[PDB]
Design an enzyme around this catalytic site. Structure first.
Site, PDB file in Angstrom:
ATOM      1  N   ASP B   9       0.843  -1.185   0.000  1.00 27.15           N
ATOM      2  CA  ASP B   9       0.000   0.000   0.000  1.00 27.15           C
ATOM      3  C   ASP B   9       0.886   1.246   0.000  1.00 27.15           C
ATOM      4  O   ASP B   9       1.820   1.336   0.776  1.00 27.15           O
ATOM      5  CB  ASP B   9      -0.955  -0.017   1.197  1.00 27.15           C
ATOM      6  CG  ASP B   9      -1.993   1.106   1.155  1.00 27.15           C
ATOM      7  OD1 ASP B   9      -1.775   2.132   0.477  1.00 27.15           O
ATOM      8  OD2 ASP B   9      -3.047   0.959   1.816  1.00 27.15           O
ATOM      9  N   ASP B  11       0.163   4.351   1.035  1.00 31.15           N
ATOM     10  CA  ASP B  11      -0.039   5.308   2.145  1.00 31.15           C
ATOM     11  C   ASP B  11       0.771   4.961   3.387  1.00 31.15           C
ATOM     12  O   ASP B  11       0.561   3.914   4.012  1.00 31.15           O
ATOM     13  CB  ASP B  11      -1.533   5.415   2.507  1.00 31.15           C
ATOM     14  CG  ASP B  11      -2.374   5.992   1.369  1.00 31.15           C
ATOM     15  OD1 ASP B  11      -1.810   6.728   0.541  1.00 31.15           O
ATOM     16  OD2 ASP B  11      -3.590   5.721   1.313  1.00 31.15           O
ATOM     17  N   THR B  98      -3.954   0.014  -2.841  1.00 31.93           N
ATOM     18  CA  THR B  98      -4.166   1.197  -2.042  1.00 31.93           C
ATOM     19  C   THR B  98      -5.601   1.711  -2.189  1.00 31.93           C
ATOM     20  O   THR B  98      -6.315   1.367  -3.134  1.00 31.93           O
ATOM     21  CB  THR B  98      -3.171   2.297  -2.455  1.00 31.93           C
ATOM     22  OG1 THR B  98      -3.243   3.395  -1.536  1.00 31.93           O
ATOM     23  CG2 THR B  98      -3.472   2.791  -3.868  1.00 31.93           C
ATOM     24  N   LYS B 133      -8.900  -4.863   0.645  1.00 32.20           N
ATOM     25  CA  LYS B 133      -7.722  -5.569   0.184  1.00 32.20           C
ATOM     26  C   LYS B 133      -7.884  -7.069   0.314  1.00 32.20           C
ATOM     27  O   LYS B 133      -7.125  -7.827  -0.287  1.00 32.20           O
ATOM     28  CB  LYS B 133      -6.483  -5.122   0.972  1.00 32.20           C
ATOM     29  CG  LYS B 133      -6.050  -3.703   0.675  1.00 32.20           C
ATOM     30  CD  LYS B 133      -5.128  -3.172   1.765  1.00 32.20           C
ATOM     31  CE  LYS B 133      -4.712  -1.747   1.485  1.00 32.20           C
ATOM     32  NZ  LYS B 133      -4.377  -1.056   2.746  1.00 32.20           N
ATOM     33  N   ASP B 144       0.400  -0.028   6.490  1.00 32.61           N
ATOM     34  CA  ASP B 144       0.653   0.597   7.788  1.00 32.61           C
ATOM     35  C   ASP B 144      -0.534   0.436   8.752  1.00 32.61           C
ATOM     36  O   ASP B 144      -0.552   1.016   9.823  1.00 32.61           O
ATOM     37  CB  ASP B 144       1.014   2.075   7.586  1.00 32.61           C
ATOM     38  CG  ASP B 144      -0.207   2.964   7.360  1.00 32.61           C
ATOM     39  OD1 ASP B 144      -1.225   2.499   6.814  1.00 32.61           O
ATOM     40  OD2 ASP B 144      -0.148   4.149   7.740  1.00 32.61           O
TER      41      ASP B 144
END
Lengths: 195, 195
Positions: B9, B11, B98, B133, B144
């Site tokens: 991802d 971010d 993402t 996801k 994260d």
């Protein structure tokens, strides 16, 4: 129990991409030849325009890349009503799984806005934007492209071909399946993949 | 042989969302209190701003919704170099997986443009935009967010937590794994999932 997961691509299944391209091409380039829908073959529309006349692939692409092309697409007949019903069935999760193509400026945003317009804000949560559908796990995929492409050789989903001008002349060999339109018996196709 | 498929991802793993939010919040609202990164807890930044002072969740969100927020995010240290190397390894396919969050106007487009800027046009092909996801099949997911969410209860991928200000205080219980940064031994994590 486990929900049946169905992927539905927007393009040529929910939103009338081909009609929109033809209509806007003709209005913007009235003195050029065009491809009547009955004469469309193969999902790559711009490439066929290029074969019609040198330079027309670029013009057709410029139509699809223009602001509001995707947002102003008309829903296909019975599409919104069928998918709303489909998503309301028990043990059924519907995801809209569709491509940004290579047109990142307006296409992603307008696809989100289009879905929100016809299906509501809630449904935005179910959208997957990807060039590669084979990495998405599901029981069924409904789209208008006869060929599978992507990193996973054998996807988990059964691929069901939705009829569009460019693919209708293909006579599918069993057990490959075709959904002729949203008036066709889509429930039977889903039910066949259930326990 | 079968390629190892790794989802990453953007971010807080490739692009410094937290630093960007803090920096732009402070410049736009210089007379308001803010959350130093060391004080961030939980992935939902706007909600924490809301707890700091009524109304600040809305202002923090307006920062993230602004044009160029995503596009001007700085790459995290060693991120671009690691992912370029990762994608160049044999038997390894990297997808950037993402979320559009609920900010469809600029976020999708700028995420594409950001990736193109740092990774090249080719890499745009490997982007999957999804809120969920768990419907993406893969061997590993690096992001994260400590919590998994989405329609599939047990995803196919192992979830590896990338350290960020908001999650670093969580002491993960084995066999849950953490990648401390891109200087950490990410190759060992990948190798552990290979045959």
């Amino acid at each position: 129990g486990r929900a049946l997961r169905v992927l539905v691509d927007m393009d040529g299944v929910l939103a009338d991409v081909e009609g929109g391209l033809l209509r806007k091409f003709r209005a913007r380039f009235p003195d050029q030849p065009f491809i009547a829908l009955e004469d469309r073959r193969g999902y790559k529309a711009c490439e066929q325009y290029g074969r019609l006349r040198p330079g027309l692939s670029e013009k057709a692409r410029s139509i699809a890349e223009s602001k509001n092309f995707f947002f102003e697409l008309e829903p296909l007949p019975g599409a919104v009503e069928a998918v709303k019903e489909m998503a309301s069935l028990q043990n059924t999760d519907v995801f809209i799984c569709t491509s940004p193509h290579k047109m990142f400026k307006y296409c992603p945003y307008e696809k989100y806005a289009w879905v929100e317009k016809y299906f509501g804000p809630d449904f935005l949560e179910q959208i997957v934007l990807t060039r590669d559908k084979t990495v998405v796990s599901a029981d069924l995929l409904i789209d208008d492209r006869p060929d599978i492409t992507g990193a996973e050789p054998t996807p988990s989903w059964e691929h069901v071909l939705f009829t569009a001008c460019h693919n209708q002349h293909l006579q599918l060999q069993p057990p490959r399946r075709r959904l002729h339109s949203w008036a066709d018996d889509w429930k039977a196709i889903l039910d066949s993949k259930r326990p």
